[PDB]
Amino acid sequence: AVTTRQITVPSAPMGWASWNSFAAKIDYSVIKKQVDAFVAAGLPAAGYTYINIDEGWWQGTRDSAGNITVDTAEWPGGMSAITAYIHSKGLKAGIYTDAGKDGCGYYYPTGRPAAPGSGSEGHYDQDMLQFSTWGFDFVKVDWCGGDAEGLDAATTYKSISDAVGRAAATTGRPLTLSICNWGYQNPWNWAAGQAPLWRTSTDIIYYGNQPSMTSLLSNFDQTLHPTAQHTGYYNDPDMLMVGMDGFTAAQNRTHMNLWAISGAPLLAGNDLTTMTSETAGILKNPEVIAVDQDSRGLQGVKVAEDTTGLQAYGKVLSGTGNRAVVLLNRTSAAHDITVRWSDLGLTNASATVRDLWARQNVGTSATGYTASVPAGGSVMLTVTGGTEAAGGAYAATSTGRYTGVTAASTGLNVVDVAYTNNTSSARTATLQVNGQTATTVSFPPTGASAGTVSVEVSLSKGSANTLALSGGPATEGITVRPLPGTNGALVTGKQSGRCADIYNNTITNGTQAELWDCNGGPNQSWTYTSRKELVLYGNKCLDAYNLGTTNGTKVVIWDCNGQANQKWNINSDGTITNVNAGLCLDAYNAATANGTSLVLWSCGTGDNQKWTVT
Numbered sequence: 104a105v106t107t108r109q110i111t112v113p114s115a116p117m118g119w120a121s122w123n124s125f126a127a128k129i130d131y132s133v134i135k136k137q138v139d140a141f142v143a144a145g146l147p148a149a150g151y152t153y154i155n156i157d158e159g160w161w162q163g164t165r166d167s168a169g170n171i172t173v174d175t176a177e178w179p180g181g182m183s184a185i186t187a188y189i190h191s192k193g194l195k196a197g198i199y200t201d202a203g204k205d206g207c208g209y210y211y212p213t214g215r216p217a218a219p220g221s222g223s224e225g226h227y228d229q230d231m232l233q234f235s236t237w238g239f240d241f242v243k244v245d246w247c248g249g250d251a252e253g254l255d256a257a258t259t260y261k262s263i264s265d266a267v268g269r270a271a272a273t274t275g276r277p278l279t280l281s282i283c284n285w286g287y288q289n290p291w292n293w294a295a296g297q298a299p300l301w302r303t304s305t306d307i308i309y310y311g312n313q314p315s316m317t318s319l320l321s322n323f324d325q326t327l328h329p330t331a332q333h334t335g336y337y338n339d340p341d342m343l344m345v346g347m348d349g350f351t352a353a354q355n356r357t358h359m360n361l362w363a364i365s366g367a368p369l370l371a372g373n374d375l376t377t378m379t380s381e382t383a384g385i386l387k388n389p390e391v392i393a394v395d396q397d398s399r400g401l402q403g404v405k406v407a408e409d410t411t412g413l414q415a416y417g418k419v420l421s422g423t424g425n426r427a428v429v430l431l432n433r434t435s436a437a438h439d440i441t442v443r444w445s446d447l448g449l450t451n452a453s454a455t456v457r458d459l460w461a462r463q464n465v466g467t468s469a470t471g472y473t474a475s476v477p478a479g480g481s482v483m484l485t486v487t488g489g490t491e492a493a494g495g496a497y498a499a500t501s502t503g504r505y506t507g508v509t510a511a512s513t514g515l516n517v518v519d520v521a522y523t524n525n526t527s528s529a530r531t532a533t534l535q536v537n538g539q540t541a542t543t544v545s546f547p548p549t550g551a552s553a554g555t556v557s558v559e560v561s562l563s564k565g566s567a568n569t570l571a572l573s574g575g576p577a578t579e580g581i582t583v584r585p586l587p588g589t590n591g592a593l594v595t596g597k598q599s600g601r602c603a604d605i606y607n608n609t610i611t612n613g614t615q616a617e618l619w620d621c622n623g624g625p626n627q628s629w630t631y632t633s634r635k636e637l638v639l640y641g642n643k644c645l646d647a648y649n650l651g652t653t654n655g656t657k658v659v660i661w662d663c664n665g666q667a668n669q670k671w672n673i674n675s676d677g678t679i680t681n682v683n684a685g686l687c688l689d690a691y692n693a694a695t696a697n698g699t700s701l702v703l704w705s706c707g708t709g710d711n712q713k714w715t716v717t
């Protein structure tokens with residue numbers, strides 16, 4: 104049964120932000136009208152809380168003591184006047200700056216002349232204290248000066264995070280940090296613990312363009328980093344285009360569904376003053392919001408794609424035997440899409456299916472569910488009352504170290520970590536799985552009795568997995584359950600004993616595969632499909648670069664495109680051959696060390712061309 108309670112973790116921010124509809128064309132009156140429409144539409148009761156003032160409020164001016172100064176013709180009463188107005192509505196207020204010396208209003212002016220000086224570098228503590236003193240509850244910290252100056256994102260945002268924490272401690276007003284560095288330098292590796300949210304890609308929409316489902320989907324794909332998100336820390340696929348001109352009701356729901364399955368922030372970006380009744384209702388759907396804001400804090404993942412473009416996404420919800428599912432159709436025709444219990448990490452026992460847009464139960468099954476999905480459309484379900492797959496349970500074999508952890512397959516697993524935190528404040532620890540990049544986990548107050556928080560981790564097939572915690576509360580056991588829909592395999596070189604690896608969890612098209620010490624991370628877990636693809640992160644295909652057909656052709660990751668250069672034969676002699684070329688996956692020069700490049704080469708008997716893929 105349920106025997107140790109699950110501790111609720113903080114949800115992603117919900118609210119509205121000024122960028123998508125106004126660009127830098129903002130002032131007090133713009134924000135006030137949006138606040139009034141937000142309130143009139145009943146957004147606050149649905150959970151929407153933040154009113155975020157984005158680029159355009161500050162032209163880069165400072166007084167002689169280095170204090171940020173604003174133009175009171177645009178901001179009468181100064182910035183504490185607009186925070187007071189927002190607060191008078193029971194809402195929270197957000198502000199915006201840059202990590203560097205000059206901001207995006209300087210580097211990429213959009214609706215205003217360039218604003219030199221519009222960044223916080225050299226003033227992190229001063230500016231963070233200022234924002235907090237003015238009354239801001241949220242700050243979005245952009246990267247235009249960081250990118251321009253050559254700054255290191257990880258160390259820079261750490262310094263910024265420290266200043267955010269000091270500012271909030273001084274004023275007594277909590278300050279929510281949004282890291283906005285567009286997925287540059289792989290923020291999923293380092294942002295959890297520094298901030299509750301971090302941008303995973305470039306902008307969902309550029310001022311002057313129409314909302315695009317293509318852009319939406321690219322942002323969604325780029326946000327999927329399930330080991331990086333947990334315990335109040337979220338991947339951020341960007342501000343919503345819900346309700347913007349050109350998006351249909353169906354596209355608006357699909358936007359909500361995909362953000363909800365990720366557990367993404369819901370920061371509306373439409374013009375609230377002309378918002379339709381239908382759009383308001385789509386933003387406010389409480390069942391969809393409840394999935395987005397799930398107490399367990401986990402990120403949804405792809406669990407099936409039996410036919411290209413016909414996809415099932417699953418999310419592990421709070422409690423036991425509960426799942427949310429999105430069925431998504433990226434093809435040009437309506438098709439049936441099925442989700443199987445086995446893929447969701449449930450046993451073949453009865454569960455109840457509910458449609459979150461119909462707001463009605465639509466069937467039971469002990470095996471799965473199929474719905475017709477329109478071209479470009481999606482269906483949003485929960486599957487509840489199911490039976491969880493059998494877990495492993497483990498006790499620490501040394502201080503903060505769990506060893507001998509078992510996975511039937513390489514792939515993603517849900518770990519519930521038991522602990523007691525009988526104090527009034529959350530504590531953090533560093534978690535490292537095998538030799539993977541470490542992550543930070545937060546442990547909220549439990550009272551006197553133990554509770555669990557959950558994390559998603561990627562493990563290697565077998566019983567040699569380790570989970571090691573440093574710092575934070577003593578833990579009292581872990582539970583481990585697989586998500587079979589995420590199953591993959593290490594591709595291990597016979598000669599080297601090393602694994603096909605994409606450096607440091609990079610997702611960029613054209614990154615070349617290399618040998619690396621096997622660690623079972625997402626950047627090493629390859630799913631071989633019925634279409635002979637070798638798929639990484641659920642959405643990148645092992646690819647012979649530019650359909651190269653000769654010795655030395657680079658083997659890279661690339662968006663899956665159905666071509667022959669992304670198809671691979673796993674041969675009985677241990678070779679892996681590219682279909683287009685007939686050449687063998689090859690560890691270059693028969694080197695065996697970390698960083699050895701993988702290429703295509705004419706097949707022979709050599710062991711740098713031999714692999715295991717189980």
Ligand SMILES: O[C@@H]1[C@@H](O)[C@@H](O)CO[C@H]1O
Binds near residue numbers: 122157247283285306
């Ligand atoms: O990514 C941000 C966008 O969200 C808005 O803040 C304008 O500046 C860009 O750099």
Ligand SMILES: O[C@@H]1[C@@H](O)[C@@H](O)CO[C@H]1O
Binds near residue numbers: 624
């Ligand atoms: O964990 C990864 C490892 O697999 C390799 O890609 C080098 O970078 C580390 O972050």
Ligand SMILES: O[C@@H]1[C@@H](O)[C@@H](O)CO[C@H]1O
Binds near residue numbers: 648649650661664666
């Ligand atoms: O179509 C190929 C693609 O598969 C990748 O190899 C990049 O180059 C393109 O020409």
Ligand SMILES: O[C@@H]1[C@@H](O)[C@@H](O)CO[C@H]1O
Binds near residue numbers: 691693709711712
């Ligand atoms: O034999 C290896 C071959 O497999 C390829 O890696 C190129 O270098 C050669 O020395």
Ligand SMILES: O[C@@H]1[C@@H](O)[C@@H](O)CO[C@H]1O
Binds near residue numbers: 606617697698699
């Ligand atoms: O980017 C490279 C990566 O490909 C790996 O080989 C280690 O060195 C880094 O500089």
